[PDB]
Design a protein around this ligand. Sequence first.
Ligand SMILES: CCCCCCCCCCCCCCCC(=O)OC[C@H](COP(=O)(O)OCCN)OC(=O)CCCCCCCCCCCCCCC
Ligand SMILES: CCCCCCCCCCCCCCCC(=O)O
Ligand SMILES: CCCCCCCCCCCCCCCC(=O)O
Ligand SMILES: CCCCCCC
Lengths: 64, 65
Amino acid sequence: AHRTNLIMAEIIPCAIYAAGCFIAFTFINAQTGVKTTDDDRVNSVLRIIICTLAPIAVNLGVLF
Amino acid sequence: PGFHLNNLFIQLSLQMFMLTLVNLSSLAHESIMCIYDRNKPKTDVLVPIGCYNFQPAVDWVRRYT
Ligand SMILES: CCCCCCCCCCCCCCCC(=O)OC[C@H](COP(=O)(O)OCCN)OC(=O)CCCCCCCCCCCCCCC
Ligand SMILES: CCCCCCCCCCCCCCCC(=O)O
Ligand SMILES: CCCCCCCCCCCCCCCC(=O)O
Ligand SMILES: CCCCCCC
């Protein structure tokens, strides 16, 4: 049906705003003010996903 | 309906402007800065070398405010 694909449109505005924060959090961790070290790897995405999922997992375990 | 639309659009404007403010605050904090006024010549370098000019970024803040 067209209604099913039609309903999920309302999520595209508020999802973009989420990415709007996600960049602002990465940039400071990018250390671009000082001369950036080459071929060194580091990440924060796992921190973000565990932050977003852990309280939900805790609540679900409580419900269980 | 126009009052309802204005009411939505005001809060919408603050929310987008506030996102833009956060982006600018990160971009200004991470970078080195240079300050100048309206007495600038046609084009010249400033006292420190390799800096980035963002004074219109904060003048837009005053104008929008
Ligand atoms: C909270 C629940 C409601 C909010 C979330 C749902 C509404 C947002 C997502 C729905 C998808 C619609 C996309 C725009 C329509 C479109 O695509 O029309 C297509 C046209 C073409 O665009 P263009 O001129 O840029 O030409 C293309 C140039 N590249 O748009 C326009 O002419 C601009 C008019 C935008 C619509 C005006 C009304 C929307 C604001 C009111 C809705 C929010 C509050 C409702 C009251 C409570
Ligand atoms: C891309 C054009 C609009 C710019 C972004 C509009 C603001 C996004 C939605 C506001 C933040 C989230 C609050 C609304 C919650 C939601 O319905 O997703
Ligand atoms: C939150 C709205 C601001 C726009 C940032 C969200 C979407 C990012 C798209 C622009 C950057 C990606 C395109 C250029 C970089 C690339 O080609 O990978
Ligand atoms: C441009 C429409 C935005 C819908 C979300 C408003 C909070």
